[PDB]
């Protein structure tokens, strides 16, 4: 009788992470409770620039602060962006699905640098530290946050226990609405920060099951430049599945 290889979750969700040659992990937040898996826990606790995912506080900020609101359309003023699907007008809540950093900068320099570091303080959002410029702060240093705040971060906005207004949670959340299907949803947001090294991948936010319940994830993952951007989607989808939390 030959013998079988046995193995669960915790074991196939590290392999997929090496079938990408990459070093990555995935925190779960339910009920209160953390679980790791993934090829590199220690990231878990390790601190990374949050690049795109830092749009979710930038909006609850904006917003909260009367900077913005959620119908303001911010108009493309005609220079050549990153992507051509950026160079339209669009509201805060597009810009958040297309990630779209021109917009964001746009309102980072509305709430200015002094607000902005008393709100991320307040808040204690990661190491809470912006510097000196409001533009980019989230992307190259010196804000930084480990995947276990992110996960944390993202359950408490899912479960509007964020210190601010209800009426802020609740639209930021509709602005992160992915997919909705069988009675599920996922809401999330991808981050990539690719002007460092090593470069950062994100994908963090919550699926709401069918009778309502809240699973929160934040995948953290080493980036580099031949991966395609879909790479996270299909880690954190597979890993979901195996975790029977779709
Ligand atoms: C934020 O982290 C950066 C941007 N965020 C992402 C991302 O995480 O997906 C990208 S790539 C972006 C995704 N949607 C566009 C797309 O796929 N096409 C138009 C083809 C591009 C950026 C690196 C950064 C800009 O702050």
Known sequence: TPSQIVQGHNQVIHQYFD????????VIQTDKKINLYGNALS??????????????????????????????IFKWKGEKRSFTAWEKDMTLGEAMKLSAVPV???????????????????????????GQQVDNFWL??????????????????????????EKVQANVKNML??????????????????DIKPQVGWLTGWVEQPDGKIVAFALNMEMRSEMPASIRNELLMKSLKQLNII
């Not at 079938?19 to 995935?26: A, I």
């Not at 902005?116 to 303080?121: A, I, N």
């Not at 190259?140 to 207004?165: C, N, Y």
């Open 19 to 26: 079938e990408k040659n990459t070093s990555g992990v995935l």
């Open 43 to 72: 990231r878990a606790n390790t601190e990374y620039v949050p690049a795109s995912t830092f749009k979710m506080l930038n909006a609850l900020i904006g917003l909260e602060n009367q900077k913005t609101d959620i119908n303001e």
């Open 104 to 130: 964001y900068q746009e309102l980072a320099r509305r709430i200015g640098l002094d607000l902005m570091q008393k709100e991320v303080k307040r808040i204690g959002f990661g190491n809470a530290e912006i």
């Open 140 to 165: 190259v240093g010196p804000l930084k946050v480990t995947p276990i705040q992110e996960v944390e971060f993202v359950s408490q906005l899912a479960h509007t226990q964020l210190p601010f207004s």
């Open 177 to 194: 609405l992915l997919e909705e299907s069988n009675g599920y949803k996922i809401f999330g947001k991808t981050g990539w920060a690719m």
